[PDB]
């Protein structure tokens, strides 16, 4: 349905987050796996990433994705969104921060989307298991058998059973918006957000709407800027800095809450 994306749009947005084994090293990746939930009886797992699915930049148009490519919420078509543990997982659904897939047993969980210049693949060390139903061990659901009650993640987009809270982003550090104008540190502003800054001796500690050049610092290395924004919220992740604006205990429904079905 459509209103779920319209409570997932209101203030939620992508965010870059720390990611281990991003390819061959550690990343501040745009799609960072956190809190993967493997507990169903068919190897079906739902993972909370840090890049919005479904939502394009104006509506939903449920074939697109949007991620935080630096300082612009860039949207693309979902071309190859792949999930693997030991073999590729046949992903079944995606909504907001969450992917839901049918994975074989493995010892890692790695996801990635294609964009064309880069791969942006993240990986997390999780012990994903294949829990059978009943009193016989399988390693893949069969063609025929008895219909037993099993707890599985519903593919339905909408449910009000459980929520996660959305919190105002912290102060996103950025050193790429400072330069030397003539011989002094100049602080460019992204034209739509105010940037806080801090330099050699303590300076203006609340930021400013427009650009400025500080004479107390002549080297970019000793002054830096925390870009701030209060127009789009994020989900309070353990790998994001909490803002001094300790308010707004918001809400965000979890799409694929567990249900009782037949296996």
């Amino acid at each position, epitope marked *: 349905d459509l209103d779920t994306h319209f409570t997932q749009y209101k203030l939620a947005r992508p965010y870059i987050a720390d990611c281990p084994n991003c390819g061959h090293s550690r990343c501040d990746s745009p799609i960072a796996i956190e809190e993967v939930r493997g507990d169903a009886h068919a190897g079906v797992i739902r993972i909370q990433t840090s890049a919005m699915f479904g939502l394009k930049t104006d509506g939903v148009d449920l074939a697109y994705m949007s991620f935080m*490519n630096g*300082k612009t919420q860039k949207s693309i078509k979902i071309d190859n969104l792949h999930v693997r543990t030991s073999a590729p997982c046949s992903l079944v659904s995606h909504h907001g921060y969450y992917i839901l897939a049918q994975c074989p047993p493995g010892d890692t969980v790695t996801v990635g989307f294609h964009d064309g210049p880069n791969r942006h693949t993240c990986t997390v060390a999780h012990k994903v298991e294949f829990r059978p139903v009943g009193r016989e061990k399988y390693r893949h659901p069969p063609e025929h058998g008895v219909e037993l009650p099993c707890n599985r993640y519903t593919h339905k987009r909408a449910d009000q059973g459980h929520y996660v809270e959305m919190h105002q982003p912290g102060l996103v550090a950025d050193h790429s918006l400072l330069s030397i104008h003539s011989a002094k540190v100049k602080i460019t502003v992204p034209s*739509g957000a105010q940037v806080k800054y801090y330099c050699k001796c303590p300076d203006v500690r609340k930021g400013i709407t427009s*650009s400025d050049h500080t004479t107390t610092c002549t080297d970019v290395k000793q002054c830096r800027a925390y870009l701030i924004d209060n*127009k789009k919220w994020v989900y309070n992740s353990g790998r994001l800095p909490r803002g001094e604006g300790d308010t707004f205990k918001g809400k965000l429904h979890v799409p694929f809450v567990p249900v009782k079905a037949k296996c």
Partner: antibody
Amino acid sequence: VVQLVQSGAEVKRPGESLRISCKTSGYRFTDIWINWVRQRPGKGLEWMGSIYLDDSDIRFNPSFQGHVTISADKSTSTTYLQWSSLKASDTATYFCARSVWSGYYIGWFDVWGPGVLVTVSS
Amino acid sequence: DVVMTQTPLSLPVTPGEPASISCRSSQSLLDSNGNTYLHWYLQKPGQSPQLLIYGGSNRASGVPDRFSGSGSGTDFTLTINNVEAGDVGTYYCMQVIQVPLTFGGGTKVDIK
């Protein structure tokens, strides 16, 4: 479909006030920048200002302080462009345009209004 | 403040062959993450302008495959693979990186 609509074209005299309005429809989020731009007769456009609907955060051109004011209303999802004392140089088309939030930047103006024509002569 | 320049200030052309328009800015529009903050708008005579290309290279909705954007750093180029009669009007390159965000001087494309 999304529709952006402004008030009709108007003729005014110098020295009085004026308020034109631009209304958004077919798009039910308030996480939007709505902005004003002036095209003079036969000359190009000049970005004049921008306002974010949610927090009423302003972004002014340095050539239009005091002369002009931009405000917003949540319930009707409208932006008001207000002039206190129109001048002989305010004869132009004014377009209200829509730029959805995309990072920390004003973005791209995907849909524009029909365009009001405000003329002040002597 | 940044100043934008368009070349040519007017472009006569017939349907059937491509067209190019080069916009230029005082300083680079790129970021450390490699993303261009340009927007190419088209205004046909009579009605309001409409967004034609966004992001400098990315393509806005509704417009045809025909048009294209390219370039880097300070120099950016709009290309039309083959013009039609419908593309008469004014093209405008605009940047966003610094307030005030200013449109270009403009260029006018008309049937020869």
